[PDB]
């Protein structure tokens, strides 16, 4: 029970979701008012920066966009 963050994969041309651990790490940081947060995926080190909504590969500087899904209000049946 946390928000679903996504990162854009320019290869498949699609928004992909994070692992449940990486999604929880990111969403905890977001909830606490952090401007950035670190995690690893594929044995690669990432910072997500909330101020620019991008994910940075710390080793190469390569920036991929992230998004926060918005759940409908009201909710649908």
List contacts with ligand APR (CB under 6 A). 7, 9, 11, 18, 41-42, 44, 57, 60, 62, 64
Distance CA 77, CA 55 (A): 34
Nearer residue to its own copies within complex by CB, 40 or 52: 52
- Give which of ligand APR, its own copies, none residue 57 binds (C-beta under 5 to 8 Å, depending on kind): ligand APR
44 binds its own copies (CB under 8 A): no
Q: With contact defined as beta carbons under 8 Å apart, do 29 and 3 qualify?
A: no
Shortest Cβ 72–ligand APR spacing (Å): 21
Distance CA 30, CA 37 (A): 8
Distance CA 41, CA 58 (A): 12
């Amino acid at each position: 029970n946390s928000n679903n963050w996504r990162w854009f994969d320019d290869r498949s041309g699609r928004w992909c979701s994070y692992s449940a651990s990486n999604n929880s790490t990111i969403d905890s940081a977001w909830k606490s008012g952090e401007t950035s947060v670190r995690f690893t995926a594929g044995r690669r080190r990432y910072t997500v920066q909330f101020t620019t909504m991008v994910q940075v590969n710390e080793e190469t500087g390569n920036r991929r966009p992230v998004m926060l899904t918005l759940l409908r209000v009201p909710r649908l049946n």
